[PDB]
Structures are given as structure tokens and as C-alpha cells.
A = this chain, B = another copy of it.
Amino acid sequence: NELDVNDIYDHLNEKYSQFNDVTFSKPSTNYLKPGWILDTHFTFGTSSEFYNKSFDALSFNHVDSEFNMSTCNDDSECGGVSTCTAPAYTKNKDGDAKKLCTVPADKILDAIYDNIVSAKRSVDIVTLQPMDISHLNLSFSSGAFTATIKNALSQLAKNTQYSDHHITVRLLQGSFTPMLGYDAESEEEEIRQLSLTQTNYLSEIASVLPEVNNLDITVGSVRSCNKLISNCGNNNSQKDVLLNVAWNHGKIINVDNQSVITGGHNLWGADYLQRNPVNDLSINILGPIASTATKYGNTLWNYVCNNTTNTFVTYANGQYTYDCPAHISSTYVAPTDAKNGLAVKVMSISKLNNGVLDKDADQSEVARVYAFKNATKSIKISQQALFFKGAFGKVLHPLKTIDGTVMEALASAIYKGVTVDIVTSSLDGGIYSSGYNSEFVYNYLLNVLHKAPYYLERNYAKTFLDKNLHINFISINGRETNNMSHNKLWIVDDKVFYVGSHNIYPSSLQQFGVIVDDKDATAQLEKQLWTPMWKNSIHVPI
């Protein structure tokens, strides 16, 4: 029989029962409506020259500064794959939308806006802090995501202006930032800079809300470890300076403890929604799984509130305060017509160690090692990278688990005749590089098969690899060799798949994700993303 998520949950509950409903959850029924796949990327099968024309403006138009798309009077004025569209997410506080040349990737903005403006109780956003890129300390979001969020909150304020109660809005980012350039001694100044940026972000939001409104907005940063010279809180065998920092890496937009957007997307517009997009995936799902996401948020916010090295501030009732929103209720209440759509079984898995919870609290790695070790037919993987270069050049591999590593599980799968198909970012992907070529991964697996219980002679092992392992890297069209992917995706037996933040390559960052178990949903995901991507990926023969 094929992989059942129930088996994953049973294994975790047997081995880590103290983290049930903390870093994983009993599978529950949730609902996927049309549009639930938020896969953003260039148009597979074309070319970057063609796709990038989608952002060209004719002389009499211009590129909008808020959304970085061309203005627009009808479809004829839009190039590439774009069309003329007046999305609701361009609607500013005075109600006026803009005509822009939009592209399919903007579906993610549609999903964020639509989810936020419907809030009746709470909006809960967890992300990673934008990267430097010279332009001074941005926080929470960049590019079109910022305007989208602002416009959504404006609309939310109008939609709730006669509400009985206030809406809790939480924005939390994992912060890298003392560490980027010099470093571990300077934490005080860094807090000061973060405080300024966060205050300006909140002030900008407040300036597009009515003077009196029912939104209680908190912004904050979290980092759980800055040690560099010693362990952050884990059971790793590997040791490396770059593993000895930690902040949140999970990515969540959770409305009313009901509607969750989660996946690999940071809220960084230039990386996904402009020229030369990075490939990435999130999903939009509704149901009790939101509870688990809410719990994840609560764990981090509790940590921020009872250890404020970190920083936060909230604006409510016309005032800045340090009222800290540590807890949104995780109890699930089905909205009306919640059962609309495709019903699927889903469990959560998280990684909350390295200074937030106890060092044993990494159940995400265990669940994926189990999934790969128990695949019966196939494993499909799409990642940015599978290995990560340590501080002085050491290759760091996916982390050790009571059940071994991902690489050991994949070696077991290959020996047993399970098909393993892998898509990596390109080696020449700049900031989003795979770090290591296909040959490296092939030889790492070869060496795993030389040792361990297998003891295979090298040439004999190559027959297993050559029959069952196929490693490609992402390409828009099978020709370009510098395209980029940020996926954290895997699919077992065309049945069970992961969407979240957790890269296969190692780090100490906290992570959140979900495991869906359903053939119809997996088939939609493969039709929409995996098959096109695979057909256009490039294979470097060994």
C-alpha cells in the first residue's frame, strides 16, 4: 500500500508524543477551492525575453511605482503574457483601482488581498525579513506585496468599521540582521534600527486607515539564537558556525484561524512578480489546519513577548503601545460554506527548536525522512538546494534524525527501486543557487550505498542510481541555464505532498509546513506545476 499521512502521524506520536499539537497534529479534513495552487514562475515553455516583455511599458504609459507593472488601457498595450486588468488589490484607501498589465504570478496577490479583507477576527502574518539589497532595512514585505498589504488593511478597516470588537493583526518576521555584516557584539544598535523600520511600517499602515478604526496592529521581529560559537539547541551530529544562528523561516498568512496561505514564498515582490522571477509555491487552504498554523504563531509570539533581545510595537486606538499579542485562540470554528471545494486530509509539521522550544522539537525533518523511507513507488522533489556550504567550505548535509537522514532515505528508496526525480535550482542561479552540481549529489548517494547496510561495490551501485535517480535543474524552457527556484516541495507516490518553508538543505531556522494526502489534489498539483517544470528542466548527464 502507498504512503498514508496517518502512518507519519502515528510514527511521530509514538516517538515524540510530548510535541503533539506543538510541532505536528492529527490529520484533519480541510478544503481546497479553485485557485488553491499559488505557484508563481515565468511561463514554462517560452523564454525569459518573451516573459520579461510582460513588464514593458509603451512610451505613453509608465511603470507603476507601487506594483512595478505597466499602466494600461486595454490588452493591446500589454506585452509578454500580461493582460490589462484592474485588480482589487490596487484599490487604494479612496476606493480607486488601477489598470495594470498583470501576469499569472499575481495570483498570489489576489489570494492575499481577498483573504485579508474578509477578516472578521484576526490576521496573522509570519514571514522572513527582506534581504538588505542596499535599500535601507525593509521589514516584512517589499515591492507589490507592501502596497497589497496596505490596500488590504485599508479595505479591512472599512469592512469592519461598525464591528462589535477589534481585529487582531499580527506581523512577525524572522530577523537575520545583526549577523549580515559585523555582528554578534552589536545587538543594541540593531534593535534600534529594527525598531525604527517597524515603527515606520506601522505608521505607513496607520496613515491609510481611518483615524478611528477597529484594527489592533502589532509588528515584530524574532531571532532565537545569535551564538555563533556554540549550539543553538538541536541534536545535530554536524557542527558549523553557520548553523549556530537561528530565526524564524516559516511563512504563513492566517485569517480568522480559518484561511491559511503557506509555502515557500517570502513577501518579496521583485523576486517573484517582476522580470526574471524565482519559481516558488504556496497554497491557499481552509479548515481546522489553520489551528495548527495559529499555534505556530502563538509559540513564536509568546517567545517574543516573554523575552523582549527581540522587539515589537503595536498601534491601536490611536496610540502606540507594548500590548503584546501573545495568543490568538487556536480553537477551530467552521465558517459557513466551509465544506465548499475538494476535501483533503492534512497534517502540520513544524521545527521549533534552536532556542524557541526544547532542542528535541524538530519533527519536520523526521516526518520527511519517514515519508521518503516509506515511499513505495516514487519520490518527486523540487528544491533550491540539497546541501549547504559551511563557514570554511565543509559540505553540510540534511540533518540527522533518530531515523537517519534524507540522503540515507533516498539511498534506501533507490536501492528498493523507487523512482526518485529531483529538480534543483540552477548552479548559476545567483542568490538562489543550488550550491552543488548534480554530479555531487549522485556521488554523495553513491557513497551512502558504499557504506551502511548496503556495502555495494561502486560500479554495481551506479546501476541502481542510473535506473532510478534522475536529477535535473530548473529552466524556463530547457535552454536557459541560470534560472532560479525557491521550492520546498516533495511528493511521494503521487499521493502525499509537502508545502511549507523547510528546505531539504540544512539550517537551524524554525519552520512550518503541511502534508497533504490526496490523489486528486496531487494530480492537480502535478498537472499545474510538476509536469510543466519537469518537461522544461535540464538534465546534466553523469
Name A residues whose Cβ lies closer than 8 Å to a Cβ of B: 131-132, 176, 178-185, 228-231, 238-242, 244-245, 389-394, 427-428, 430-431, 437, 440, 482
Is B230 within 8 A of A185, CB to CB? Answer: yes
Is B240 within 8 A of A182, CB to CB? Answer: yes
Cα of A391 to Cα of B179 in the assembled complex, Å? 8
Please give the distance in Å from A223's CB to the nearest CB on chain B. Answer: 12
Residues of chain B within 8 A of A427, CB atoms compared: 427-428
Please give the distance in Å from A479's CB to the nearest CB on chain B. Answer: 15
Is B228 within 8 A of A182, CB to CB? Answer: no
Contact for A431 among B176, B242, B393, CB less than 8 A: B393
Knowing A229-B228, A437-B428, say if A244 contacts B183 (CB, 8 Å): yes
Residues of chain B within 8 A of A183, CB atoms compared: 229-231, 239-241, 244
Cα of A179 to Cα of B242 in the assembled complex, Å? 12
Residues of chain B within 8 A of A389, CB atoms compared: 389
Is B184 within 8 A of A229, CB to CB? Answer: yes
Is A181 within 8 A of B229, CB to CB? Answer: no
Copies of this chain, whole number? 2
Cα of A231 to Cα of B228 in the assembled complex, Å? 15
Knowing A228-B241, A241-B228, say if A181 contacts B394 (CB, 8 Å): yes
Residues of chain B within 8 A of A239, CB atoms compared: 181-183
Cα of A132 to Cα of B392 in the assembled complex, Å? 11
Is B181 within 8 A of A240, CB to CB? Answer: yes
CB-defined A-B contacts under 8 Å, sample of 6: A131-B393, A182-B240, A183-B244, A185-B230, A229-B229, A241-B241
Is A180 within 8 A of B394, CB to CB? Answer: yes
Cα of A428 to Cα of B180 in the assembled complex, Å? 26
Is A228 within 8 A of B228, CB to CB? Answer: yes
Is A180 within 8 A of B437, CB to CB? Answer: no
Knowing A228-B229, A427-B428, say if A240 contacts B180 (CB, 8 Å): yes
Residues of chain B within 8 A of A180, CB atoms compared: 240, 392-394
Is B431 within 8 A of A440, CB to CB? Answer: no
Is A242 within 8 A of B391, CB to CB? Answer: yes
Q: Which residue of B lies closest to A242 (CB)?
A: B391
Q: Which residue of B lies closest to A239 (CB)?
A: B182
Please give the distance in Å from A143's CB to the nearest CB on chain B. Answer: 19
**4 more A-B contacts (CB under 8 A) besides A181-B394, A183-B240?**
A176-B392, A182-B240, A183-B231, A427-B427
Q: Which residue of B lies closest to A228 (CB)?
A: B228
Cα of A176 to Cα of B393 in the assembled complex, Å? 11
Contact for A430 among B390, B440, B482, CB less than 8 A: B440
Cα of A445 to Cα of B389 in the assembled complex, Å? 27
Residues of chain B within 8 A of A230, CB atoms compared: 183-185
